[PDB]
A = this chain, B = another copy of it.
Amino acid sequence: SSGLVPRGSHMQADILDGKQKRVNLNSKRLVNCNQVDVNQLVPIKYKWAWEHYLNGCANNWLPTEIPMGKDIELWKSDRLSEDERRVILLNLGFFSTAESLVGNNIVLAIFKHVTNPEARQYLLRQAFEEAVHTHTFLYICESLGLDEKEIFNAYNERAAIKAKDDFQMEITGKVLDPNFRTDSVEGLQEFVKNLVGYYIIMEGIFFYSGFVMILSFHRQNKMIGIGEQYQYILRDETIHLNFGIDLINGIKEENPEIWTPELQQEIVELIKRAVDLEIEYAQDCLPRGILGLRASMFIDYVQHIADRRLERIGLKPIYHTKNPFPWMSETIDL
């Protein structure tokens, strides 16, 4: 399309004042943007957000496409230990509802206050991916003949799962309040803490420990169907986390006055609390070791990724621990 503009190829305006509402690119903002029309996608300002959207759209998969026959045979055999089963069941219990918590938070809390069409475009992709992930866990329950009411209620029945999710509810903050606003320093700091709570802590910390447990099974040729689905989930979660980081940093950069010593320290403490709860959860999963996994490795690993998340939002590492699972940064071609 480098050819001449043909005559008659523009549409005539019959509202002479309408032109003024065309969106100026440099007037667009991540939050508190009421000066321009939020319904028009164009012109795109946040290329990073649009890129995340395009990348996510290229990652389409469904749980129902992954064969579970071998997982079914292994699950029904005596070849899995009781301790191996416990790891699997606790993870399916935590994940089955965690995805709904992330998904509902995108819609009910985040979307409204991210006043930018290209970022909202990503958010709708992300929320849909959370639906696919919830579907995954129903598909696993039904494939393996598990009691799905038992699995989905896990966060009310297992203390270490509940403590993680109650912590999540607390960091959700006042954002769900219908009268909550981001057009003050306090409001915007509150909103960023929600973003840290969901992108950095829930998706960036609480999930990864489960990923290691399940992908370890996969590495050992056990439950490769569940493992393959978690691989697709991890591919999604990586983008989710990167968008969150970009959103947080962009908001900081556009509103530098919210990023105070006090807020920074508050964020570190929430992350510290999250690390402890994740370690406690890992201890509940592994009271005894399974092949290549024990609770003590998760002390180092959870602290390690916590450091990586901290750096990405401009805060200093605080644990300085080794990563006992370097294979988690392997490229998987799906």
Contact with B along A136-156 (1 / 0, CB 8 A): 001001111111111111101
Judged by a CB distance under 8 angstroms, whether A194 is at the interface is no
By beta carbon, the residue of chain B nearest A83 is B8
Note all chain B residues with C-beta closer than 8 A to A97.
Answer: 39-40
CB-CB under 8 A for A43 and B158, given A85-B8, A86-B8? no
Would A162 and B15 count as touching, CB distance under 8 A? yes
Would A107 and B104 count as touching, CB distance under 8 A? no
By beta carbon, the residue of chain B nearest A79 is B6
CB-CB under 8 A for A108 and B112, given A42-B138, A157-B15? yes
How many angstroms between the C-alpha atoms of A97 and B132 in the bound complex?
27
Within 8 A of B (CB), among A50-91: 53, 57-58, 60, 62, 72, 75-78, 80-82, 85-86, 89-90
Would B130 and A76 count as touching, CB distance under 8 A? no
Judged by a CB distance under 8 angstroms, whether A211 is at the interface is no
Note all chain B residues with C-beta closer than 8 A to A134.
Answer: 41, 121
Would A40 and B100 count as touching, CB distance under 8 A? yes
Within 8 A of B (CB), among A86-115: 86, 89-90, 93, 96-97, 100-101, 103-104, 107-108, 111-112
Judged by a CB distance under 8 angstroms, whether A322 is at the interface is no
Judged by a CB distance under 8 angstroms, whether A201 is at the interface is no
Q: Which of A16-24, A213-221, A224-232 contacts B (4 or more CB under 8 A)?
A: A16-24
Out of B80, B112, B128, B142, which one reaches A124, CB within 8 Å? B128
Out of B2, B6, B39, B156, which one reaches A75, CB within 8 Å? B6
Would B11 and A89 count as touching, CB distance under 8 A? yes
Would B101 and A39 count as touching, CB distance under 8 A? yes
- How many subunits of this chain does the assembly comprise? 2
Out of B58, B141, B147, B157, which one reaches A18, CB within 8 Å? B157
Note all chain B residues with C-beta closer than 8 A to A149.
Answer: 22-23, 40, 42-43
Would B121 and A5 count as touching, CB distance under 8 A? no
Q: How far is the CB of A8 from chain B (nearest CB, A)?
A: 4
Judged by a CB distance under 8 angstroms, whether A9 is at the interface is yes
Judged by a CB distance under 8 angstroms, whether A127 is at the interface is yes
Note all chain B residues with C-beta closer than 8 A to A10.
Answer: 89, 147, 150
Judged by a CB distance under 8 angstroms, whether A7 is at the interface is yes
Note all chain B residues with C-beta closer than 8 A to A40.
Answer: 96-97, 100, 149, 152-153
Contact with B along A199-241 (1 / 0, CB 8 A): 0000000000000000000000000000000000000000000
| Given pairs A9-B85, A107-B112, 5 additional interface contacts (CB within 8 A) | A6-B76, A9-B75, A15-B158, A18-B157, A43-B148
